[PDB]
Amino acid sequence: MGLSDGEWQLVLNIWGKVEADVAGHGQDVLIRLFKGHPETLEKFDKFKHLKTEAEMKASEDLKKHGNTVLTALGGILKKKGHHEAELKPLAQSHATKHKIPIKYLEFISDAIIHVLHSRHPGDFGADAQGAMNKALELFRKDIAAKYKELGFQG
Ligand code: HEM
Incomplete structure (x- = not known):
């Protein structure tokens, strides 16, 4: 499920553009999520x-809240897969406190990619799309594994 050095560079390069306005991006992400999937x-x-x-x-x-979300995800992506320590608290709260179904992580992933298309069409080419998808897929896989370890089946 891992990424090459090249794929991580594509991920962190487009993420760098997010970093120019983390709260604005985060806001747009949650808007897309809430409008596309009202159950969230x-x-x-x-x-x-x-x-x-x-x-x-x-x-x-x-x-x-958008800022809070993308700040945490940014911390995770910058670790390039080596994100155990960052994922631990997030899986714990989302599995056991907020009880967020694992499916909703796929929805917010979709929404992130949508915002990147919306804000950076020049710079978010197909190679960066593929790599971002891989990075978010890794994130989801690792957290879904923690969810089950914690006894959350949702
Ligand atoms: C990329 C995926 C996500 C990241 C990085 C993320 C990050 C965070 C962080 C850092 C917090 C505050 C600290 C904490 O409670 O853990 C938080 C809170 C929260 N998250 Fe998430 N989150 C994600 C996905 C979601 C999704 C998809 C939902 C709901 C559909 C959700 C629902 C909530 C709720 C209800 C809170 C508490 C809000 C409050 O009471 O102020 N999260 N999230």
Whole structure:
């Protein structure tokens, strides 16, 4: 499931563009997720009134959470697969506290890739698309393994 040095470079190069506006990207990611898959929004009680993209875009609380999400994922990707320590706390909370079905991680992955297409069409070429998909697939695999280790079957 691993990535070559080349594939990681493609990943970290496009990620570098995300780093110019982590909160903006994070915001757009959660908007895509919540609009494409409303069942995910149901996990955030404090966002229940947010129904339209405009309402979501206007929420600084949602933007702040977007920042929190991509900051954590950024820490993980920069480790190039060597992300045990970063994944431990995240699997623990998401498996045992928030109880986020593993499927929803695939949805947020899709949403991340969508935002990258939206914001960086010049720089997010097909090689970088393939590599990002691989990187997110590794992330999902490793966390899904932790979920089961923790007894979370959702
Ligand atoms: C790339 C995947 C994800 C990353 C990196 C991520 C990261 C985080 C982080 C860092 C936090 C705060 C610390 C913590 O509680 O662990 C958090 C909280 C949370 N996450 Fe995630 N998350 C991801 C996916 C998801 C998805 C897909 C959902 C729901 C469909 C979700 C639901 C939540 C909820 C409900 C909280 C608590 C929010 C609050 O009460 O303020 N997460 N996430």
